[PDB]
């Protein structure tokens, strides 16, 4: 009895990368040649299945790999170096972007430290960039930790919304 990957791959609305969804599926056969030929993906790297997924813009899809570095890998979704699973991603400009821009998709932009593998942070505390404290109030060197992806239909593929699914074991 094969796995119901359509449950997460074809979900109505995905989650922001910083608040990534962790849907887990157990005791089903996870075949790969079947998931490949289902739809032409843009990324299909491989290295009780946890199928966690989220939306990131295209030029940051490369950060969903073992031992990467950058906004996404550091502060949003960190994979360990010994990752044993698959990273599946594909374009979704028509679904996740609207004329004038879809802003529902967010990402963490600063953090006092890096994420451990598979850690998820969804705090809303004012990031202190300077020696002066913020005291909850936002200003110079006092930035809100979450920002919004643009996602206009005119953006280049680098700044275009991409659906990402990671099969972990």
């Amino acid at each position, epitope marked *: 009895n094969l796995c119901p990957f359509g449950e997460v791959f074809n979900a109505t609305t995905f989650a922001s990368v910083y608040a990534w969804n962790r849907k887990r599926i157990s005791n089903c056969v996870a075949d790969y040649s079947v998931l490949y030929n289902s739809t032409s993906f843009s990324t299909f790297k491989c290295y009780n299945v946890y199928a966690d997924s989220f939306v990131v813009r295209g030029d940051e899809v490369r950060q969903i790999a073992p031992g990467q570095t950058g906004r996404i890998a550091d502060y949003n979704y960190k994979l360990p170096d010994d990752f044993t699973g698959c990273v599946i991603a594909w374009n979704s400009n028509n679904l996740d972007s609207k004329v004038g821009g879809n802003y529902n998709y967010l990402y963490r932009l600063f953090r006092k430290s890096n994420l451990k593998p598979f850690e998820r942070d969804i705090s809303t505390e004012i990031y*202190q960039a*300077g*020696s002066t404290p913020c005291n909850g109030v936002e200003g*110079f*060197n006092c930035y809100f930790p979450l920002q919004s992806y643009g996602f206009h239909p005119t953006n280049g593929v680098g700044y275009q919304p991409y659906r990402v699914v990671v099969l972990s074991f």
Partner: single-chain antibody, 229 residues
Framework: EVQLQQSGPELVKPGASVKISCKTS????????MYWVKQSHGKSLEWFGG????????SYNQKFKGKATLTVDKSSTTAYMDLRSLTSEDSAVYYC?????????????WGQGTSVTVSSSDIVMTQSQKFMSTSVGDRVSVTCKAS??????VAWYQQKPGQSPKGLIY???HRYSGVPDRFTGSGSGTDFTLTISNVQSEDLADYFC?????????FGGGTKLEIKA
């Protein structure tokens, strides 16, 4: 390794406009906030304004509203202060300084200063003793009183004859890297004291305190130390 190298001196006519530079190296430019300090002859330090090189955000002390513009060039790892419409009041030494947070609070590295001379409810820090004299080996204390609560967010700086300020104490009572055990910091809230334990020959300098609790940052008036032997 870390090094803030500034432009040369510039003499200009009044009502002119000049852009000085602060070329950084030895560290990742986008990591730390850059600041600028004005200091007139024999007068104290005035926090001029800051800039975040990672995104361009700035903050100006309203005392010097619209008299300068802070910018950064990430390709050349250089910070710029463009002074505009120069009057005789503007002639002074201008220091660029680096915010050492998240490691060493306040301004842990200072440029060498560019001497610009033209020719043709805030926080207040109180340093009662302008001058003060001791001898080698004596103990001595310097005091600061703030108009408001500033918690422990205060730094202590040392300016030796004709030299850029060097950080001594950050966060009320923590020494910077390579500061003798003789300098000990003390205080909390409203009253802060800096104690120089075994006064040395080197210690002949002018000591300022500086609050980094709220912008615009403010300095003390300078307490001059003088040694005889």
């Amino acid at each position: 390794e870390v090094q803030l190298q500034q432009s040369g001196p510039e003499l200009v006519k009044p009502g002119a406009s000049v852009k000085i530079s602060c070329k950084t190296s030895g560290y990742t430019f986008t990591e730390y906030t850059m600041y600028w300090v004005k200091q007139s002859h024999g007068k104290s330090l005035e926090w001029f304004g800051g800039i975040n090189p990672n995104n361009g955000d700035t903050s100006y002390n309203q005392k010097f509203k619209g008299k300068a513009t802070l910018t950064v060039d990430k390709s050349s790892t250089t910070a710029y202060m463009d002074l505009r419409s120069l009057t005789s009041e503007d002639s002074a030494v201008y220091y660029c300084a680096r915010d050492g947070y998240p490691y060493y609070f306040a301004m842990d590295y200072w440029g060498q200063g560019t001497s610009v001379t033209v020719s043709s409810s805030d926080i207040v820090m109180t340093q009662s003793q302008k001058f003060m004299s001791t001898s080698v080996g004596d103990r001595v204390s310097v005091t600061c009183k703030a108009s408001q609560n500033v918690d422990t967010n205060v730094a202590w700086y040392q300016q030796k004859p004709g030299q850029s300020p060097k950080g001594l104490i950050y966060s009320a009572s923590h020494r910077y890297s390579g500061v003798p055990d003789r300098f000990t910091g003390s205080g909390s809230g409203t009253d802060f004291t800096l104690t120089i334990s075994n006064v040395q020959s080197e210690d002949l300098a002018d000591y300022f305190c500086q609050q980094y609790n709220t912008y615009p940052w403010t300095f003390g008036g300078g307490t001059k130390l003088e040694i005889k032997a």
